[PDB]
């Protein structure tokens, strides 16, 4: 045999990466970006049919970086199937000018990126759930482009660095039971906090989640577990056994409980402090939801 | 005891019944069979084997086709 | 207007209130509060810095030439990796006495213990209701001390 | 019986060559652009990744860390993904530098793969002649048809062509080659056996090993050199060179280069110079998997239903001519579909053996957009009767050997049993007429031994 | 007469556009021949954990061909895929698989949420002679006093494969309007090639929604129509209490390895005949075994699984639409907003609200698969408020 | 009451241990368990072949009449009882 694509989500929060200079780390977006790049390239080093899909994530945006919009790709769009005719980008190959034709539209791109420190949004932070989809509806493209005793082996990697963001939690959820349908692996390596929320994904998908050690001591890992087919994984013995998770509040107050109840037929489960819906203007119908205030 | 520099060919028993039919109608006396164990193994004097690479299948067709 | 009027108020409510559950709500807001003198903008000014200063240094490369070479943080690397190779000491044979521990509970205590479920989903169930004192029969509030004993 | 070892042989390629050479022969097998070329001859995913640590590991990682880096699933899988890895001499085994004995790779070809991984403007990557891209002269698909008909006057030539080939020494060594010959009046470049069987293969590697066998006939030049310049070519396409292969050159490098049109792999123009030009056909060497671009031309869907050959597609003769090896004798008209024979065809594999996988590429390989939306099962008996067959005609299994009868004892013959067992010198045995079937090459071993007691 | 007149057929529709170019047309014609009906939802109200009931029409017009070799065999095949797309959309919900057969009803399958079970039992269903008559009333009378006993805060509907035939029953099946329209249980039909109007009266007097079986295609259009959660009749309930977070149980916690296996005849859960050694956990029973995100046996309450089934619907109802235009804005470099390409076979898709220009592989990826624009997305959340 | 328990053995392998282990009675056997299959589980000897038969078998009653001189008794309407239920 299949073509074994590969699908790469890096975090860059420039404010933590920023956050990253302000310790005078010994591991620098700059350190942090060129590994994976080769590891995006080692993805390559194992069949000339592999393919990549990097996107980061900007406070405005999320630009395709892997392989490119601008116009040293967007007349070229890659050599092997339909040919550009395009002499010099289209000449030199072979698992070193590859990357350097990918190194290039990634510098070139987050330069584009981390020229627009102008955020007057209101910390539009990580935003990671709207990046997704734009990986999922170019592979289904990529998908159509050749099936025909083509298996897609798509794999998603994510990469974590910062927090996630304020973004909504159905978006946030929605694509992954969208993946689940989508029957493609997601992985996840985290740098500074843990996300619970994305960890479930991980538990949707049961891909692989990671808290690093060390941010320096990120290139071993790296090179082992977040490295593909999922016949290195279901393979190769040796998996991050924990998947703590525990979960299951309720949104009227606060709370961390066992006992939910509908407050309307909009899906809404609210904490039991709740006399009147506030899901709505509708009345509740008077027989059920003071039974939840009765016993 | 006794050195025998035949070749050891292999194949059912449906044919290694029958190169001693080829034996018996060898142009020449037995070279053919040199000694065959049971029902797999057998031995030739090495001249016609190449020949008998294509002299055997040309011969078994012709004599079923009538 | 039924569920368009949903819409408008559990929204606004997963807007105000936007997932307040376990790890949702409280790692969120206090990392938000980490970001201290972002209004003030002089931790933005300095990441804006920060974002203007290693501008140039991804591209470069060569200080991206070589961020590999640290083998120090291989053997660590290598350490937890073989740390979680090899854990030990756990009770290897967990079972073998479970098929004794199988076939005397399941010949009656599997369906000796269904018949109280019969029984005491419905011994939840009236007093599932009772406080309301409605469905306060004496088929029922006896019906609790009955197969109580039993 | 019949070789069968010369048609694919794709990892042994980088392994029986290599290993039958010594390590300062293969120390200069780690040029630069030779890095590419172990990584995918070989095709473990095992041991593909037991490199990717080594960028990152210049310590020597103690051997029982990866001997136990995967347990019980598929231990074999991973003693097979590993004394290979180690059989192409790429790793040391540290004797005891903490202790035990922790492997490690050659570190002159980490050398030579990490500049192949990240950084170096090097004299492969950059600074003395590699590449150049001028203004556009010449383009690619023209040169794709000298890509296409190169190999027609390659393979119409093995077998035959009224047409002629061009003034050739490489005839003299495919006659050499024992896939032609030619008897001594005149030297008819017919075919001996296994031409028929390259007829039978589509893929460049053989060309590639008798290229690599180019220097084995009384040559002194770099064979370091030629196989760098294997890999210069598996290059896509796309760059003519301001005469970028004289800024470049060496002695072979350019005079086997006039072979390389000859071989139609390089495009020269007047002079035989002024520029290079590497071919399309620079990939499908790089695997000789079968491979999803290696479809030449694309004709269409076939069938075989009802097993009786079942196409048309008139394309040109040179399939034309590997269906003339393969269906004659009620050929028809502007459509290709010479009907079906059980023995004819069947007969059309005696020059060649077994064409079992070559049934089932040209399968794959007749009218090429036939996967496209056709069944997986695209013979479902049809395979089977190929099989059978050649499952047929192949009665013999030619083997020579030495036979010990009469033997005078019972017991001191299962002794000679564990003697030649021992050696490995048996084939066969019949106990119960005291019987052992034993190598002629190492008779001599017992005679030897049976002489001395 | 007609052997030139069969062939009066044949001989026109055989011509084209002649000279040059033909044969082209009647190719034009078949993809126009396509593009059937798309969505036409928009819906709000209703629509919530459903309580379906198949209803098996087994007769003798199964033996009938028309779409296949049976018509059980166009109907029980695409169930299983109607199971588990429902099942994908709705696991809030749960379906009685129902078989009228011989002037009766057998209740095949228990009103349930677990997919092998109703699965298996089609595939236990492949060999059904369908000998008899059916029966509708008994079909009634088990979808009665099963759902009789559902709470009123249930949603109550009713799912009948109906082969089109004569309603073979007795006992004042139009008496059961009355029956059913004051039970609050709704009843939908689709007719299998034909139309029963008692039945189309039936639906009618029920807010059920009834249909004919067209073809195999349109057999799956109707489904599809009827995977969604319908607006059904106002009044049924608001509220529904007591949804038992579970937890996940690892069993290692604390005491490592202290039971061999965690179902014992004893063990508060265990509840299925197998063996276990601790996944699950529910709030109320506290009851450990095979993991289940739908419901128990003695606590008796909604084993709910929120990231999975409160999340389902959640976001399946708050949809808005594209446009098209034929017209050339090139936005982007002549691209797709979201695949980044171009065919332009004039319908460049655009966002309501955020008017992105996206294509038909962009705009089924979202109506079919994504639900919504993420477009949207980085334009809703950073002025978000 | 008596042919469910016997009928049934899994059933009465439940209702055996509340005599054998002493739980509960006959009594209270069928008080709180069974309770709503009083309609469930008795709906199959009520309706067989849909009683209260009028526009069902009235359809199949002319043309199985007859097929032998004594092709009848087949089980319990087999080919005779509702001709004798409308009547
Ligand atoms: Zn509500
Ligand atoms: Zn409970
Ligand atoms: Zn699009
Ligand atoms: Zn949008």
């Given amino acids: 045999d299949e073509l074994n694509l590969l699908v790469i989500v890096v975090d860059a929060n420039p404010i933590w990466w920023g956050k990253q200079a302000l310790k005078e780390s010994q591991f620098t977006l700059s350190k942090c970006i060129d590994a994976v790049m080769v590891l995006g390239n080692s993805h390559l080093f194992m069949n000339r049919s592999n393919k990549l899909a990097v996107i980061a994530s900007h406070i405005q945006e999320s630009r395709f970086l892997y392989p490119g919009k601008n116009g040293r790709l967007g007349d070229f769009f890659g050599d092997p199937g339909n040919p550009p005719e395009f002499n010099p980008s289209g000449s030199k190959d072979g ?165 939910g109840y509908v407050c309307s037929v909009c899906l809404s489960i609210f904490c039991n402090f709740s006399p009147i819906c506030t899901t709505c203007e509708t009345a509740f119908k008077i027989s059920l939801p003071p039974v939840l205030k009765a016993k | 005891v006794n050195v025998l520099k035949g070749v050891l060919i292999e194949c059912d028993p449906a044919m290694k019944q029958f190169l001693l039919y080829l034996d018996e109608s060898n142009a020449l006396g037995k070279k053919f069979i040199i000694q065959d164990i049971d029902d797999t193994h057998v031995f030739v004097i090495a001249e016609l084997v190449n020949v008998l690479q294509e002299r055997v299948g040309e011969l078994m067709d012709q004599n079923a086709f009538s | 207007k039924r569920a368009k009027l949903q819409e408008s108020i559990e929204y606004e409510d997963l807007g105000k209130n936007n997932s307040v559950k376990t790890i949702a709500l409280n790692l969120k807001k206090s990392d938000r509060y980490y970001h201290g003198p972002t209004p003030i903008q002089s931790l933005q000014y300095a990441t804006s810095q920060d974002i203007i200063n290693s501008f140039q240094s991804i591209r470069q490369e060569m200080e991206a030439y070589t961020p590999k070479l640290t083998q120090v943080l291989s053997s660590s690397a290598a350490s937890s990796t073989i740390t979680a190779l090899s854990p030990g000491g756990a009770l290897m044979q967990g079972g073998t006495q479970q098929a004794i521990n199988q076939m005397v509970p399941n010949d009656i205590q599997s369906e000796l213990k269904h018949l109280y479920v019969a029984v005491g989903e419905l011994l939840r169930h009236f007093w599932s209701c009772f406080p309301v004192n409605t469905p306060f029969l004496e088929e029922k509030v006896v019906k609790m001390k009955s197969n109580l004993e039993r | 019986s019949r070789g069968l070892n010369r048609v694919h042989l794709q990892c042994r390629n980088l392994q029986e060559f290599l290993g039958g050479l010594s390590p300062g022969v293969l120390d200069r097998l780690y040029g630069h652009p030779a890095t590419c070329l172990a990584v995918f001859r070989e095709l473990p995913s095992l041991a593909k990744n037991w490199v990717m640590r080594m960028l990152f590991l210049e310590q020597p990682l103690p051997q029982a860390a990866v001997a136990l880096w995967v347990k019980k699933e598929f231990s074999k899988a991973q003693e097979e993904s590993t004394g290979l890895l180690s059989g192409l001499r790429i790793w040391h085994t540290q004797l005891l530098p903490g202790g035990l004995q922790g492997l490690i790779l050659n570190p002159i070809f980490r050398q030579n793969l990490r500049i192949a ?13 590699q590449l150049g891209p001028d203004k556009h002269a010449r383009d690619v698909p023209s040169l794709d048809k000298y890509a296409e008909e190169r190999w027609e006057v390659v393979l119409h030539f093995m077998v035959g062509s009224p047409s002629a ?117 620079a990939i499908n060497l790089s695997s000789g998997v079968s491979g999803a671009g290696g479809t030449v031309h694309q004709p269409g869907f076939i069938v075989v239903e009802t097993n009786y050959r079942l196409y048309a597609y008139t394309e040109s003769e040179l399939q034309i001519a590997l269906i003339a090896l393969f269906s004659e004798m009620l050929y028809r008209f502007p459509n290709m579909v010479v009907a079906q024979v059980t023995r004819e065809s069947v007969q059309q594999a005696i020059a060649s053996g077994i064409t079992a996988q070559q049934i089932i590429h040209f399968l794959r390989t007749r009218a090429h957009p036939v996967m496209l939306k056709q069944t997986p099962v695209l013979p479902p008996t049809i395979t089977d009767q190929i099989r059978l067959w050649e499952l047929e005609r192949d009665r013999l299994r030619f083997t020579e050997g030495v036979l010990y009868n009469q033997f005078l004892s019972q017991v001191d013959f299962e002794l000679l049993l564990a003697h030649a067992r021992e050696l490995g010198v048996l084939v066969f045995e019949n106990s119960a007429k005291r019987l052992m079937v034993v190598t002629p090459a190492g008779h001599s071993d017992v005679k030897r031994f049976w002489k001395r007691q | 007469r007609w052997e030139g007149g069969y062939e009066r057929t044949w001989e026109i529709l055989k011509e084209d556009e002649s000279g040059s170019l033909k044969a082209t047309i009647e190719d034009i014609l078949f993809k126009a021949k396509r593009k059937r009906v798309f969505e036409h939802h928009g819906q709000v109200r209703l629509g919530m954990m459903r309580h379906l009931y198949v209803v098996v029409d087994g007769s003798r017009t199964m033996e009938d061909q028309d779409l296949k070799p049976n018509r059980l065999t166009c109907t029980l095949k695409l169930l299983e895929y109607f199971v588990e797309e429902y099942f994908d959309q709705n696991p809030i919900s749960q379906i009685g698989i129902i078989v009228t057969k011989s002037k009766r009803a057998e209740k095949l399958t228990e009103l349930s949420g677990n997919p092998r079970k109703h699965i298996t039992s089609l595939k236990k269903a492949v060999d059904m002679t369908c000998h008899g008559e059916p029966s509708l009333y008994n079909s009634l009378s088990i979808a009665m006093q099963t759902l009789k006993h559902m709470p009123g805060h249930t949603s109550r509907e009713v799912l009948i494969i109906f082969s089109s035939l004569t309603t073979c029953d007795p006992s004042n099946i139009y008496d059961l309007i009355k029956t059913l329209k004051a039970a609050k249980i709704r009843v939908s039909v689709i007719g299998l090639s034909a139309e029963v109007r008692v039945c189309t009266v039936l639906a009618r007097e029920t807010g059920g929604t009834y249909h004919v079986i067209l073809d195999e295609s349109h057999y799956k259009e109707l489904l599809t129509h009827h995977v969604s959660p319908p607006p059904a009749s106002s009044s049924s309930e608001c509220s529904l209490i007591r949804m038992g977070f579970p937890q996940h149980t690892i069993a290692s916690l604390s005491d490592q390895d202290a039971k061999p296996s965690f179902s014992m005849a004893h063990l508060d859960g265990n509840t299925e005949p197998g063996l276990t050694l601790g996944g699950y956990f529910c709030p109320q029973c506290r009851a450990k075994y095979c993991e289940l995100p739908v419901e128990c046996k003695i606590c008796g309450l909604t084993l709910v699984s929120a990231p999975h089934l409160a999340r389902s619907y959640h976001h399946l109802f708050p949809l808005d639409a594209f446009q098209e235009i034929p017209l050339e804005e090139y936005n982007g470099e002549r691209f797709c907003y979201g695949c980044q390409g171009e065919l332009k076979d004039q319908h460049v898709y655009v966002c309501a609200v955020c008017q992105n220009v996206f294509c038909v592989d962009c705009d089924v990826f979202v109506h079919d698969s994504l639900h919504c624009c993420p477009g949207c997305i980085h334009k809703i959340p950073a002025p978000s408020g | 009451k008596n042919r469910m328990l016997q009928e049934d053995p899994v059933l009465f392998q439940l209702y055996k241990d509340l005599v054998v282990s002493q739980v509960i009675s006959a009594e209270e056997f069928w008080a709180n368990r069974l309770n709503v299959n009083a309609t469930d589980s008795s709906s199959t000897s009520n309706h067989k072949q849909d009683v209260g038969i009028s526009a069902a078998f009235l359809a199949d009653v002319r043309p199985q009449t007859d097929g032998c001189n004594g092709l009848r008794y087949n089980l319990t309407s087999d080919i005779i009882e509702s001709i004798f239920r409308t009547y």
Avoid at chain 4, 117 to 129: M, R, V
Wanted: glycine letters at 6%.
């Fill in chain 1, 95 to 259: 698992k070193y000018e590859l990357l350097t034709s990918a190194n290039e539209v990634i510098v070139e791109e987050i330069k584009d990126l981390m020229t627009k420190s102008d955020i007057k949004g209101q910390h539009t932070e990580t935003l990671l759930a709207g990046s997704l989809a734009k990986a999922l509806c170019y592979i289904h493209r990529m998908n159509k482009e050749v099936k025909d005793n083509q298996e897609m082996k798509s794999r998603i990697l994510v990469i974590k660095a910062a927090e996630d963001s304020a973004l909504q939690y159905m978006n946030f959820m929605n694509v992954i039971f969208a993946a689940q349908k989508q029957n493609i692996l997601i992985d996840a390596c985290v740098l500074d906090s843990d996300s619970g929320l994305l960890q479930q994904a991980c538990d949707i998908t049961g891909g692989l989640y990671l808290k690093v050690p060390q941010m320096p001591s990120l290139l071993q890992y790296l090179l082992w577990v977040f490295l593909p087919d999922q016949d290195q994984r279901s393979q190769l013995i040796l998996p991050p056994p924990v998947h703590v998770d525990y979960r299951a509040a309720c949104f009227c107050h606060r709370n961390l409980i066992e006992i």
């Fill in chain 4, 117 to 129: 991984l990240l950084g170096g403007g090097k004299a492969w990557s950059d600074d003395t002649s």
């Fill in chain 4, 165 to 281: 080939a061009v003034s050739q020494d490489l005839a003299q060594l495919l006659s050499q080659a024992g896939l032609m010959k030619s008897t001594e009046p005149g030297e008819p470049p017919c075919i001996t056996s296994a031409g028929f069987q390259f007829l039978l293969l589509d893929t460049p590697a053989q060309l590639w090993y008798f290229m690599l066998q180019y220097l084995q006939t009384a040559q002194s030049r770099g064979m370091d050199l030629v196989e760098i310049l294997s890999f210069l070519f598996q290059l896509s396409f796309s760059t003519l060179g301001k005469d970028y292969s004289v800024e470049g050159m060496s002695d072979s490098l350019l005079n086997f280069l006039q072979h390389l049109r000859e071989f139609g792999l390089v495009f020269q123009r007047k002079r035989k110079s002024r520029r290079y030009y590497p071919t399309r056909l």
